[PDB]
């Protein structure tokens with residue numbers, strides 16, 4: 414929709430703190446911090462696919478809105494994820510071991526803006542069309 418396309422990371426704030434709050438160790442935080450990923454979003458019928466591509470790490474999720482699915486995260490957490498559409502915004506929650514984190518994806522002007530929250534820590538990443 415507003416979301417379909419190939420998106421390149423152009424800015425990031427508080428990503429190290431967000432990863433620390435998730436309990437991620439130094440080596441994996443170093444890798445994730447210096448990564449400069451592209452995000453490819455596509456839709457076919459009921460199914461949305463989000464591909465992440467970077468020099469040292471690739472990931473992919475596919476899902477139907479409102480339907481819980483199993484996901485392996487970049488840092489190797491095994492989580493249960495649910496993604497819904499609320500007022501134009503894609504809202505994702507990941508649940509594991511009694512914990513949760515939220516990831517919201519929104520379109521604003523020329524930007525894809527992503528906000529990630531874990532407890533008291535908020536991270537913001539911005540992507541533009543490749």
Ligand SMILES: Cc1ccsc1-c1cc(-c2ccccc2)c(-c2nnn[nH]2)c(N(C)C(C)C)n1
Nearest residue numbers: 432437445448450465467470487488516527529
């Ligand atoms: C490393 C790590 C540890 C705990 S979370 C995490 C992580 C890693 C990446 C990543 C993916 C590939 C290349 C480099 C980093 C992204 C990401 N950034 N852009 N696309 N995926 C991400 N975000 C929350 C996502 C949902 C926006 N979280």
